[PDB]
């Protein structure tokens, strides 16, 4: 017992020293949509699944244009994500005003992290329960990061969020070597396949749910939306 | 002319043996235009203690009301009387706060303590410094002249009847000094058995 105790303390520490709050946060990431991240390190792609609650609806976006050289996919609830996104856009704006430099996405990501971490380190703040795959094309190339609501910042050459993340991971490790530092086309095919692994797999591939987003050497932020992915299929 | 002079005014107090006296002018006009020959600038707080104030009229009304607030509450808490001395202090503290601002007032305290049976007078300055008066007390714009007269006219022993003549003539001399035509004056003659109030007859234009 003491489940309620561990909710009531955000300052929680247990005999095993675990912090349940983080645990809860992880279950919330797994509740979200399916997203993969992939990079060759000269191009980066992300296949993201955009889904719809019912028949008479149409899919809600989970690919956000954060900037004209940096971007994200969200995986978890839409409402919190909006709030974070304003802070990061404004942080990009002053970089442009003052410094007139894009600024390393690596440097950016680290700064955002602190400001969240410190309110877990005291009274108030519930977890934000959105995980992100953050992509951007910086000075030393593209780079990929996973931001977690545990403020666990890691650079990976590919990653995945969504229930049955592991499945797709194992395929990414297998195909990992094939990715090399070329071909646009190949990265997307592997993504389409990989994305199938994340789903229950009883659901057949569809062009209305999938969405493909690229950034690369001479590329900036572009989205392929609906039917538009068929040319590249 | 000044920040105290637009309606002028002078106030005198003289001490007698076994009695004290406070006399003042009355007049209110607006600048130099005399509308009325009345306006009390002396108020009392309890029978025997008299307080005469000499700023601008506007200021005077506000200050008299402040002293009422303070004194009443003070009196209530201690639950016993206030002394003359106590009033003097109070005025100082108030005088100190107004010093940054354009409320400048000269008070004069007069009264005869009848739970101690001694005469008491003081004057206070508009920068807030209290100066304990003796035998004669001056206030008003006419002060330099007024001082001259008070040093001359006084004699060491005084009876209310002699004291009455002394103030009256003082008051008579004083109204000629005004360029603001401050006509009308009151006298209060205080004894620790009686107070007399007299309005006096004087020049009229």
């Amino acid at each position: 017992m003491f489940r309620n105790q561990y909710d009531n303390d955000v300052t929680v520490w247990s005999p095993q020293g675990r912090i349940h709050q983080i645990e809860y946060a992880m279950e919330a990431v797994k509740q979200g949509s399916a997203t993969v991240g992939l990079k060759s390190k000269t191009h980066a792609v992300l296949v993201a699944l955009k889904r719809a609650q019912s028949e008479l609806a149409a899919h809600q976006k989970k690919i956000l244009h954060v900037d004209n050289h940096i971007g994200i996919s969200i995986a978890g609830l839409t409402a919190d994500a909006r709030l974070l996104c304003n802070f990061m856009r404004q942080e990009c704006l002053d970089s442009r005003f003052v410094f007139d430099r894009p600024l390393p996405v690596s440097r950016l990501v680290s700064l955002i992290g602190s400001k969240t971490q410190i309110p877990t380190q005291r009274y108030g703040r519930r977890p934000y329960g959105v995980g992100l795959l953050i992509a951007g094309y910086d000075d030393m190339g593209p780079h990929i990061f996973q931001t977690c609501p545990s403020a666990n910042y890691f650079d990976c050459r590919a990653m995945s969020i969504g229930a049955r993340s592991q499945s797709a991971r194992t395929y990414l490790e297998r195909h990992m070597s094939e990715f090399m530092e070329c071909n646009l086309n190949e990265l997307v095919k592997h993504g389409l396949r990989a994305l199938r692994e994340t789903l229950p797999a009883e659901q057949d591939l569809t062009t209305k749910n999938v969405s493909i987003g690229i950034v690369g050497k001479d590329l900036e932020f572009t989205i392929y939306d609906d039917d538009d992915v068929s040319p590249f299929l | 002319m000044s920040i105290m002079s637009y309606n002028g005014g002078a106030v005198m107090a003289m001490k007698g043996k076994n009695c004290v006296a406070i006399a003042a002018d009355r007049r209110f006009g607006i600048q130099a235009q005399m509308v009325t020959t009345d306006f009390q600038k002396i108020f009392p707080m309890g029978d025997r203690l008299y307080i005469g104030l000499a700023g601008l009229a506007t200021d005077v009304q506000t200050v008299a009301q402040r002293l009422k607030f303070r004194l009443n509450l003070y009196e209530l808490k201690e639950g016993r009387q206030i002394k003359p001395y106590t009033l003097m202090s109070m005025v100082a503290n108030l005088l100190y706060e107004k010093r940054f601002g354009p409320y400048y007032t000269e008070p004069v305290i007069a009264g005869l303590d009848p739970k101690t049976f001694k005469p008491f007078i003081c004057s206070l300055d508009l920068i807030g410094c209290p100066m304990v008066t003796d035998d004669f007390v001056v206030s008003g714009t006419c002060a330099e002249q007024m001082y001259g007269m008070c040093e001359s006219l006084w004699e060491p022993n005084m009876d209310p009847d002699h004291l009455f003549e002394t103030i009256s003539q003082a008051m008579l001399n004083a109204v000629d000094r005004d360029a603001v035509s401050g006509m009308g004056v009151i006298v209060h003659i205080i004894e620790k058995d009686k107070i007399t109030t007299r309005t006096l007859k004087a020049r009229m234009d």
Binding site: - | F28, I30, V35, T36, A57, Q61, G101
Partner: protein, 194 residues
Amino acid sequence: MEYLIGIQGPDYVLVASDRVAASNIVQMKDDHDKMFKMSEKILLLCVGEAGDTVQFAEYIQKNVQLYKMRNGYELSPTAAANFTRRNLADCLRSRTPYHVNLLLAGYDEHEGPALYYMDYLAALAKAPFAAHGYGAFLTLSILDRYYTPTISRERAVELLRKCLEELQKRFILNLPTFSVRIIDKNGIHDLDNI
């Protein structure tokens, strides 16, 4: 320009108040009067800065009516005057500039009427009659001479008439005559002008 006269008979108060309605540097219209009726027991006249007068008057009207409803009682007009004076006393000191002259004309139900004159140094006085502005110079000699304490009702109307003829005669200003008001305990009426 700015002018206001008053006289308190022991049965009513007549006051002369200013008029304009198209006044810039020309005359073409005059109909509007810088007075607000404080209630029906008290009436108030005012002169000073034109913008400040309306701003001041409205705050005082708003408050007095609240107290009337809350107590379910009416304040004496004397009571009202010290209140008004206290507000104006603050202002003078402050950065905002209310330094306007007010005339509170009041009728006491069982104390008889009372007339109050307020200056811009903030000074409250009661006078059986007084005046202010350019009007005052001419009127006050008449008022002193023709008036005698507790004169009749009939006599006041004649006395006010004389003023208009003096104002015409000596010649001042460029707009003609005054607006006159009657304040009584039958409320407020009007004394027509030529």
